[PDB]
Amino acid sequence: DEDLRFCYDILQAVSRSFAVVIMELDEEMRDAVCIFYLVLRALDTVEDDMSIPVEFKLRELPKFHEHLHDTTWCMSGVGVGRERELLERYTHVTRAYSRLGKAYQDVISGICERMANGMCDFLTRKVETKADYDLYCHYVAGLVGHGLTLLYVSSGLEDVRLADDLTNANHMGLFLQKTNIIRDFYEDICEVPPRVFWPREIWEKYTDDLHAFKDELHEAKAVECLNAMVADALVHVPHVVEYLASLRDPSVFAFSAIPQVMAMATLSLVFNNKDVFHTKVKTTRGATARIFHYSTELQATLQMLKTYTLRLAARMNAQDACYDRIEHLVNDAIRAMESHQ
Amino acid sequence: DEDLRFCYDILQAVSRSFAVVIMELDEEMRDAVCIFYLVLRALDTVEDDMSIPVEFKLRELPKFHEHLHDTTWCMSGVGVGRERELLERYTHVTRAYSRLGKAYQDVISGICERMANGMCDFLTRKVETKADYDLYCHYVAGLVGHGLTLLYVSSGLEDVRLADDLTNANHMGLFLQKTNIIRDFYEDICEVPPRVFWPREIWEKYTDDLHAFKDELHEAKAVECLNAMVADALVHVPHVVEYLASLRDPSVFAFSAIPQVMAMATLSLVFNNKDVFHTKVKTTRGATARIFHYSTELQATLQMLKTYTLRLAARMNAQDACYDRIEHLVNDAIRAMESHQ
Amino acid sequence: DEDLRFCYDILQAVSRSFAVVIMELDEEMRDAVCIFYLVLRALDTVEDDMSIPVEFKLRELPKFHEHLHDTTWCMSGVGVGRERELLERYTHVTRAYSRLGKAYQDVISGICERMANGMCDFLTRKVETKADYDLYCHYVAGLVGHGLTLLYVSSGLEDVRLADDLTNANHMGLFLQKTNIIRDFYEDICEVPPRVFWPREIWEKYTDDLHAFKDELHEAKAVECLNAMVADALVHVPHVVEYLASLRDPSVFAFSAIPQVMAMATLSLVFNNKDVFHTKVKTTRGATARIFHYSTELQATLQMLKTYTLRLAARMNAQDACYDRIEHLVNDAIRAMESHQ
Amino acid sequence: DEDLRFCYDILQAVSRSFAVVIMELDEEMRDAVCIFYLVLRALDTVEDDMSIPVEFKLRELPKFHEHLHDTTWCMSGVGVGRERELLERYTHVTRAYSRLGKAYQDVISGICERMANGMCDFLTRKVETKADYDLYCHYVAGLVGHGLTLLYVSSGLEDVRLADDLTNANHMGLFLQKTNIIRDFYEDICEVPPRVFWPREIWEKYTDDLHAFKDELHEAKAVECLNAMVADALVHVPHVVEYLASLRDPSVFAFSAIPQVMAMATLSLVFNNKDVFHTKVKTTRGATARIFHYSTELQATLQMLKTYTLRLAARMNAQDACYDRIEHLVNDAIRAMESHQ
Numbered sequence A, B, C, D: 001d002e003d004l005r006f007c008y009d010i011l012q013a014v015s016r017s018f019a020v021v022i023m024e025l026d027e028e029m030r031d032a033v034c035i036f037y038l039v040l041r042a043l044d045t046v047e048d049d050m051s052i053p054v055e056f057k058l059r060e061l062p063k064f065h066e067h068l069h070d071t072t073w074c075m076s077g078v079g080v081g082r083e084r085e086l087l088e089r090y091t092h093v094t095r096a097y098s099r100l101g102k103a104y105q106d107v108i109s110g111i112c113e114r115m116a117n118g119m120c121d122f123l124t125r126k127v128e129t130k131a132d133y134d135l136y137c138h139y140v141a142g143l144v145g146h147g148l149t150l151l152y153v154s155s156g157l158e159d160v161r162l163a164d165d166l167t168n169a170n171h172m173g174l175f176l177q178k179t180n181i182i183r184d185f186y187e188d189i190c191e192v193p194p195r196v197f198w199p200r201e202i203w204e205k206y207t208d209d210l211h212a213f214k215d216e217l218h219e220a221k222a223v224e225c226l227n228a229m230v231a232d233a234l235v236h237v238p239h240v241v242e243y244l245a246s247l248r249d250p251s252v253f254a255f256s257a258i259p260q261v262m263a264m265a266t267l268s269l270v271f272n273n274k275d276v277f278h279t280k281v282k283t284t285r286g287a288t289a290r291i292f293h294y295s296t297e298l299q300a301t302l303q304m305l306k307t308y309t310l311r312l313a314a315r316m317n318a319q320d321a322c323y324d325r326i327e328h329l330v331n332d333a334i335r336a337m338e339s340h341q
């Protein structure tokens, strides 16, 4: 019992936000998801440490998942804060892993490698085009979408058919990662070395240097560039709706809907707002609470996404460049929503 | 009309959950059970209220049922909040009561009296032996099983052969009560004054002072006594199944299954759980939602009780000495379960 | 009464359907047919445990029919569900046995033995050819035909000049059994350990791996392999009609016509259907409701059979590999039905 | 001492291909390689036997490596020829295993267990994609390349850095295992039941039924497919050239180079050759004698490899489909060789 407790204790300590949503699931579902998260967290931890040689990463990450069967493996000099204790006591994670159904072990191990390999691809090349941006997000978010979906099936809580086409599942992950990449633009831009995710194929149409946006000036394009990033994100919404409306199990739904609705609300805020280049754009605790409270069933869930979407569209002028691309990205979204009510 | 609307309004107020389950019954049977619950409720409001003297209770309780024919009666000095209001306006209960079929009225009175007496017995003495434990749960729960079963037969929805041996009916109520007694340990002991139900004949083998389970120091002995308790409740599982399998009506079944399935799920969570000693362990709103949805038919019900049963035996370790008492009990439970598939 | 009650409350607990058809019969024969069924199922239960030794079967099976007196018998560690209860409390079957007339008693014994050995012959061996097929079905199903036919005779209800030739009596059994083997495939293929009854001589022509059928990428050949199975079945049809036509007792006809009609209906549904490889295919409640209702006399029976035989021919087209063939088999069937109108 | 005798004895009886290259190793390292082989050999005998329930393999194969410490362990009746005698007296192995550098023991156990679970993972599922193919070859061959590589470093004969990247080592195993699968096509497709490894993602393009590759009628699409397989295998060559060129110890190089060269020689003979679909194409013993004699030095090895890679290419012609892909892969392997000269 000491193993699973260490997992949940470090989970809540390294990702309190997500640590709350995950408590929507129960029994073995939450157990697997918890371990699944920690593994990917450990993986990303190593891949994020810049004091680690590139080669070491290029040959260790690809076989990271192999340590999932070695109940003796662990690290000692890596990890930021509590992220350290996770790698130093990984034994608890792997030992808990070996208790999950053989079905859960595979999805986790499989995704861990696929993601790890995807990370190695970007450890040697920059993110220039949108394809790169969509592929990168697919590795750190999209695949996460695949894994979870494969879990709802292996659990028997959802219809086996939910895993034929994972396009939407991938969309579920992209909507979150992108909404995040946008908001967390300032924190990521100043860090040394600077971690950039915004594709040159999008910001180059606005500036020569990206780290020139902090400056209160150029603020006119910063917005236009930001909106371009938002629009690019509003593309996944329609698919997000489709994926949610395909969920039947109440537990699996709340765990899948809460993050999405939370993202749409986040976008409706960061959209067409300069304050994104200087500080953290967060939703009010009241909005956070309610979302976590009503996103238990489709209807009410679609009912909120529908609201935030309008509060996103109803914030720009026909003078703002994207009044068109958005006016459609909004209808396309609302449509999908209206087609399930 | 208005009396009924009060009873149903006070119901969801004093006990939401049950107020949702009771909706599984038809207006006919529902009106009776709702009043049956409020009677036993107002009765408990007197027993559990330590703010008043014992000579007041042993004076009022014994003749509580008699008040059912006095639509004027009411008590205005016992209980807290809602429950307190239930007594000050007990009139509505008796009102609607007089509007019930004689058959129902009598069953509600017989149980109210027999329970009232039982409460008095344990009102001037504690629970030391297991027999005490069982006998008590009988007076406050087992009898409810008898009453309900009698109401089912009386109504005609269930066959008369059901009331031949109220043994399994008693088991139904015991499984629920024991599960609650096991979960609300910390809450009941942090009561002023402390409320204890765990039979001395049991904790006596793990500590001389039950209050030691609150301190982590005795975490081992605590969880070791907790598992002993859970083991005591598993004895009723095989019987609960039999009773649920003897029900023919779809409405009565659901109303009888849901609670049982909710208890098993809860029992699988608090099993070998130490959190039980510092907080209240509960199922996820989503899981309790999945239970209300499928506890409509026997089979679907049996596989849920099965799953949760297997979950209980899984969270078990071979290292500790309770693994044996249980392994044997889980089999008798799963056996009886498969014994109907 | 205490013994038959058990025999009935148990019969009604494993084959709800047959437990409804058996009531078409008369008290004298019903009680007999009932015990006759139980004994056989009690037998199949022994012949169908995969967590039980082989040298236990024969050593115990061929002494099965012998143990049908010795009212002091019973097996405590056999099957699952109610079945094991039938064996752990087999006693009620042996006294209700003698309690019952003996003209039948001998028939039960005769087959009970024959069938048991037929099962022994196949325990270690398996089905490689259609010869193994028709043979196996003979022991488990065909013989039930001989039996029932015999019981019919000895009861004076049917002509003694009917137990002379038993060919058709075997066809009734094979048809019923073979139809179940086709419909209950996925259910059997998923048995753990696996259960196979399909002639190696047949699927060796549409594939090289039977378990493969679970696939969705072998369909085309899987269905035509199914068509072949159905084709093989339709060979008994003409002989089924003939038998039903000979029966002259209203009560004995219904009990012998419904199962057949139910089979033809099911067979006319599984034919050229892929759904058979991922779920059980069964007649709608309304369809089966009409079957029990009309299959009381010959004419009505022959008409439904025909109707269903004309729905199995409506699913195929010229492009089919068994098309021009089945039209032949479908004819031989109708011809027979049409020669009694 | 007497036990290593049994080990080498059995070794020379079971494996006639590797037995020679192993015997030529340096005593110390050799014993571990001998036992390492005998271990995997015992494991395989289990997976490759069709008289065992696959329901008990999945439950015990993953435990097989545990017996490596229990000198009293052995298996009663499984496997034929000498392989049977292998487990019956598996003690000689385990006791010889005991007296080996703990490092060697850890490597054998690790690979053994990992390979075992890989077999179970492929006992239920089959090879449909080119992923299942590479993954399967990985479990039963790539891992062997891992173990040996680990054993090399463990002995100190090779630099500790040889274990850094095990990707090339994996390529080593795949080149051998694949060449055999391609060469043993006929021998395998004519089994009871049949054995197949050629990925559907490849042959589904050249036929509807793989078995159709035995008829002179489908001789055209048979070869065209065989070429697809050869190309797939020719992908691992470049890495093979790299791994060999990384070995510094003569003993290790000879043992590693010979098998690789032999495979390429065999591949150059089966390529575009159609006798494969009915006979077992092989290298003349005089050729495998020339290879053993010269594959002791890098340059000599690279040379032989090149000339075998060249004639494999000088086999196809313009009118051949694979012509283009072969050139690329061939010249790709060539360049790798000329790179180390």
Ligand SMILES: COCCCOc1ccc(C#C[C@@]2(O)CN3CCC2CC3)c(Cc2ccccc2)n1
Residues within 6 Å of the ligand: A033, A036, A037, A038, A040, A041, A044, A140, A141, A142, A144, A145, A148, A149, A169, A172, A173, A174, A176, A177, A256
């Ligand atoms: C129904 O579809 C569900 C789609 C979920 O989409 C995604 C997308 C990205 C993430 C994430 C994340 C992290 O911030 C946490 N750790 C894993 C990747 C990164 C960095 C370390 C996550 C969070 C996540 C991570 C691991 C397990 C579950 C969920 N989910």
Ligand SMILES: COCCCOc1ccc(C#C[C@@]2(O)CN3CCC2CC3)c(Cc2ccccc2)n1
Residues within 6 Å of the ligand: B033, B036, B037, B040, B041, B042, B044, B045, B140, B141, B142, B144, B145, B146, B148, B149, B169, B172, B173, B174, B176, B177, B256
């Ligand atoms: C088919 O068998 C049915 C067995 C039902 O078993 C149980 C067991 C315990 C309870 C309860 C309860 C209470 O908390 C609510 N009130 C009545 C007894 C106590 C205190 C006041 C109850 C809830 C209950 C009580 C009265 C009426 C309906 C349901 N049922």
Ligand SMILES: COCCCOc1ccc(C#C[C@@]2(O)CN3CCC2CC3)c(Cc2ccccc2)n1
Residues within 6 Å of the ligand: C033, C036, C037, C038, C040, C041, C042, C044, C140, C141, C142, C144, C145, C148, C149, C169, C172, C173, C174, C176, C177, C256
């Ligand atoms: C007028 O001709 C009548 C032909 C009846 O043909 C058949 C064929 C098969 C069966 C059957 C069956 C079982 O599923 C039930 N038990 C007996 C054999 C198997 C397994 C255990 C049965 C059902 C059966 C079994 C026992 C007694 C009566 C009928 N009948």
Ligand SMILES: COCCCOc1ccc(C#C[C@@]2(O)CN3CCC2CC3)c(Cc2ccccc2)n1
Residues within 6 Å of the ligand: D018, D033, D036, D037, D040, D041, D044, D045, D140, D141, D142, D144, D145, D148, D149, D169, D172, D173, D174, D176, D177, D256
């Ligand atoms: C320097 O890199 C060396 C790469 C060697 O590549 C490979 C690839 C495949 C095999 C093999 C094999 C087997 O047929 C024999 N047994 C082990 C795996 C299978 C089945 C049972 C083997 C043969 C083998 C197996 C065990 C010990 C030594 C060699 N080696």
